[PDB]
């Protein structure tokens, strides 16, 4: 059997969208940390498992679980991890990642082990997301507007309106957009309060050009985000990921 997603899985997942390093999961027994890097359609993720106790974990078994569609879109390769984890020890695995095509689902990391006479079972969403393959595209205003207008089919645009989770801090917002994988294009939207971005999603089989506009209303503490891309599922996925960052 598999544990349901741990409390805070979704909140924490959201912290690994625009950055690669952090603690993915921690309770009284176990700390799971991540460090990753991506280039083009590839990635390398280190997953670290720390035994916070003085007792060995036995039959320690981390498994990367991917839905059928996800497996066709995203190749994850990793090696056996030794099933014994000494008390106070930190062990690790390397996950080599290859994006074959655009994808919407996330892998689930399930960890099971014996701890003394107990059985432990933890499930968390693993932050391998489409924007990890999103790389910035610098371009002039004129070219941006040309490209924006070429993506005028209704299904190519996805929008969200949401309450700011964080202070609407101009410099941090810029940094988050860059961390998402977008270029930050200055003086495109004539309103200097707004943010405009462009990038390309790199997959083995295809590349997708994506444009975005983020419009803050500081008085109202809300944003409107617009994505345009040539693929409806890509517009949806990037819009929903990026929406949770501000």
């Amino acid at each position: 059997i598999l544990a349901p997603l741990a409390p805070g899985s979704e909140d924490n997942f959201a912290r690994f969208v625009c950055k690669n390093n952090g603690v993915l999961f921690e309770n009284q027994l176990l700390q799971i940390g991540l460090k990753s890097e991506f280039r083009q359609n590839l990635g390398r993720m280190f997953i670290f498992y720390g035994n916070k106790t003085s007792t060995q974990f036995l039959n320690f078994t981390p498994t990367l679980i991917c839905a059928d569609d996800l497996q066709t879109n995203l190749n994850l390769q990793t090696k056996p991890v030794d099933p014994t984890v000494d008390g106070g020890a930190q062990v690790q695995q390397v996950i080599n990642i290859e994006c074959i095509s655009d994808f919407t689902e996330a892998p689930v990391l399930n960890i099971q082990f014996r701890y003394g006479g107990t059985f432990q079972n933890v499930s968390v969403k693993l932050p391998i997301t489409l924007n990890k393959f999103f790389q910035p595209t610098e371009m002039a205003s004129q070219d941006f507007f040309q490209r924006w207008k070429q993506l005028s089919n209704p299904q190519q645009e996805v929008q969200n309106i949401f309450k700011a989770k964080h202070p609407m801090d101009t410099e941090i917002t810029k940094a988050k957009i860059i961390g998402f994988g977008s270029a930050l294009l200055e003086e495109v939207d004539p309103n200097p309060a707004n943010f405009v971005g462009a990038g390309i999603i790199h997959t083995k089989t295809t590349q997708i050009g994506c444009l975005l506009r983020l419009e803050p209303n500081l008085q109202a503490q809300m944003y409107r985000l617009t994505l345009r891309t040539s693929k409806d599922t890509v517009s949806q996925r990037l819009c929903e990921l990026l929406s949770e960052q501000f």
Binding site: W148, I161, D189, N191, A193, R213, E215, N217, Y223, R224, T226
Partner: peptide, 7 residues
């Protein structure tokens, strides 16, 4: 752009 979030 076609319209603006903030009038």
């Amino acid at each position: 752009f076609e319209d603006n979030f903030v009038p």
